[model samples]
Target: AKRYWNANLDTYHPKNVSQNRALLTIRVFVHNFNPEEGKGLTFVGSPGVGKTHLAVATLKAIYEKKGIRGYFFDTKDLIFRLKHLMDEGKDTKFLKTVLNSPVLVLDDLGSERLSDWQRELISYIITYRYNNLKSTIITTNYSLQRSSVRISADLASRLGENVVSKIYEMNELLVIKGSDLR
Candidate 1:
């Protein structure tokens, strides 16, 4: 795993001599990440900006560096399965997987349709993780304000404002801006 991550690091690091200093800073910050209160990072930006790449790479780094468990889930697929599990009265297993994980990566926050049940389920999972102080990383194309509306204003506030506040308390927000990397 370390080897794999090192290889990716080599590949992703900026090649230009002039960009080396900035790239080194970014790498050191990412490599030395430790959250004081909650999860360390939130990758929010427009599409094709390597949000998923950075997120999964960071998860890989955390797993290799700390031996912590981490998971990546597409919100759309998770919502579908969660809905099915709820209907079958077997949601506990899935819920446990999320709530108990050391780190969780939720990708594409606003890509799925919002239903009342889904909102509640997301709220429950996020609230549970937040209460537990478990690390969670979210990658989304939408702004925090916009994403808040998809879920109820209440749940959105909890997860977006409160929960995210915990994260921000622990880590600085790294805004990756520029042309699309794709």
Candidate 2:
């Protein structure tokens, strides 16, 4: 409905998502989507650390520079909308589009108090992409490593081991290290 990815018009706002240098290193990776050279990438950090701004920016890069169609999902918003669509019996196309997109930007990985269904959905998305060779970029506050102590165990559980396993195999982990820019 409404072609889904309608946020791009304003996503490059305020601070200019184009010039965000923190994640600029991804330019080369995203540029190589044709060769299937990039498995994926994970941007890990706290809120306002440009994790989101840069995540959206990456999608913009892939689309603008390469003319490739991509999707960007703010995990919280996606979950809520998906639930509403499910109630209306209209959830199928959304998942199909997300899975088939050559590039996907999954923003805010553990921002919700997820149900079992939600966790499974996320795991399925990642694993599906992994097996199919689709590239994804994930921005998350929850860390994939053992020493990550800033977040709660409940959040950790929502992310799930299955998701992490796929991420390990399919993404280049890029932890955004610094104070919040906001």
Candidate 3:
């Protein structure tokens, strides 16, 4: 995967190069990937706004430069599979992946239907990562005011200001404010 990204880094040049550069910096910083810090990056944005593309590109760069492991997935599909895993008593393996990954890019937050189990599961994952100071990248179309479709206020609070602060502290919000690509 790393080699694949490294070879294709240039292919991911966004149409807006400056915004792309900003996203790249956020990717590097959120990952705590300075010369000293060994964290990974998280990419956040609306759907069809190049979030995944830029994230994978950044992951490619990180892989080439530092040999870190990264994983990207659409949130809906991921949660569905996690539900199956839970039914089969394989939830631990799923949890292990999120907990152990050096960099995890959760794409399209709030696209999945709201369920208490799913919400709790997601909350656990985020809280664990936050508590451990592990790095993650999450891209969602829903803004803070519009996250009602995903989880409750308590969970939102867990991921709201503090989590966003962490992301903002590391990288600027590179909003691609324009017509929707999709």
Candidate 4:
């Protein structure tokens, strides 16, 4: 499963509850993970602030702590694969894999341009995860808090109100602000 994590996996440095509530928040979810009641977390911020690292650490902890299953996806790559699978007539199985994973981490969500199907893809998976009480962590550049982290209007509308509402309900929101660390 670690193979699915970033290639820069070993280089990240995470802070704790106070220093890095993002990592701490994910840690809390991993520590308190329950299939029926566990609420996943979201880390929303600028790039290079370790959003991916927070997720990776949470997944690592979850795996080592008690072996709950997890999958990591760079949002664009996952969507790309979904489209490819549809081309190969494998969309159903691949979609199931993403939906049915015990734990999921979606890294770098949202964009400058997206199609209707892409928005619906996000809406469907997130809604499915929310309704099923599956744990999901998200790292996104979108401003969940009306911050300066802006995307194009096209992207925002593509994301839509439904996805926003679902995210508000499904995950603990952590607005992380920092200078670019990359």
Candidate 5:
């Protein structure tokens, strides 16, 4: 139920659509995404490569098309929220809703230090969303390359092999490379 960043399609300006043709047809992403297909989008790059911008812009399209406010979770904040819930013995409605959101954006994956149980919860969410074909978008500062064993291993180490495995199965990666835009 978290809100997206203060951005929309208009606010997004990619460095070069010539190479990033995939980004040009962002509307296609919205068109193809549905419960039946359950496709996912993942943006991978270094900081300030407009990862969040693209994610929020996609969410904005969802809002315009279906009048739905797509869920956005800053991965770090989400973990803290989960921790707070556990600490206080509060209800789990928030986590449940996040798991089942029609569209969800988990911004900045692998950007936080997680405890054992926190990592377990993240893996659970990823597995559940993938199993149900929920459209989940992920933005991460990690390289999604098997060849780059160090970076790949780091991501798996931070988020767990199960979570990373589900990500590989469920998402189409958009590898953005350009100068920092921030």
Candidate 6:
């Protein structure tokens, strides 16, 4: 079953006139995307700037219009769930679905404080998708820099260089500059 994080495309209204461009860009990408192209999106901005909202909106829009089965996963929750299952010696069968999905919205790429194993898992996920040419949408509050040490929020500390590089290849960058609705 597809999870949306409780977001719907119809309900994603722009916070104001200033956000119209951001909304339009996401909509255009959603409408024009083809899985074979492996085109994806990266929404970078501050909190409450509708990054998650827009990412979820795109996932919903694509599923509705193109009938593409996609999955939406918060970065922290995804890692935690997999870790829990592994700790219990259970099979992480859903990973296969996530790995092979036509499109995946990996919301909040650097939200958690990742350990080496966690980082490896995230890297593996992105690398698998990158190799297979599967589309992915990522939302993050930090910059997508390739630096290993994050001096500030301007750099992504949770996302290692390997994942950042693969993401750069997989997605088109869309910087969402707008007023924080929250």
lDDT minimum window of 10 residues, candidate 2: 1-10
Of models 2 and 6, which has the larger TM-score? 6
The residue-by-residue lDDT of candidate 3 on 1-182, one tens digit each, is 25334434567555675456755675556355742332444444445666666666666666677787777766777778787887888458766877767777666654434676766666666666666656666665544432332433333444454444444433334444223654
User: Could you give candidate 2's per-residue lDDT for residues 1-182 as a string of tens digits?
Assistant: 12324434245433444234444557676667662643777777656666666667667777887888787777777777777777799568987887888888888885656787677677778888988888888887854534533333434567776667767778776666555356
* Of candidates 4 and 2, the better by lDDT: 4
A best-first ranking of the candidates according to their TM-score comes to 5, 6, 4, 2, 1, 3
Residue 41 error for model 6, in Å?
0.7
Per-residue lDDT for 2-77 in model 4, tens only?
A: 6435533234445434226555555567778885764777776666666776777777788878688788898888
Q: Which stretches of candidate 2 lie over 4 Å from their true place?
A: 1-24, 35-38, 143-156
Root-mean-square deviation per candidate: 5.8, 5.4, 5.4, 4.0, 3.1, 4.1
User: Which candidate order results from sorting by lDDT in descending order?
Assistant: 6, 5, 4, 2, 1, 3
lDDT of 5 by residue, 9-65 (tens): 765555765226546667777766565567778777777677887888888787788
The backbone clash count of each candidate, in order, is: 0, 0, 4, 0, 0, 0
Model 5, position 76, has a per-residue lDDT of: 76
lDDT of 4: 0.70
lDDT of 5: 0.74
lDDT for predicted candidate 6 compared with the true structure: 0.76
Among these predictions, the greatest lDDT belongs to 6
Model 6: residues with Cα > 4 Å off, grouped in runs:
1-9, 16-18, 87-92, 143-156
What are the models' TM-scores?
Answer: 0.70, 0.75, 0.69, 0.80, 0.84, 0.82
lDDT of 6 by residue, 22-87 (tens): 777777888898998787988876677778877877887898999997988888888888878768
User: How many clashing residue pairs, candidate 3?
Assistant: 4
Q: Which predicted model would earn the best TM-score?
A: 5
Give the runs in model 4 whose Cα sits over 4 Å from its true position: 1-19, 142-156
TM-score attained by model 4 = 0.80
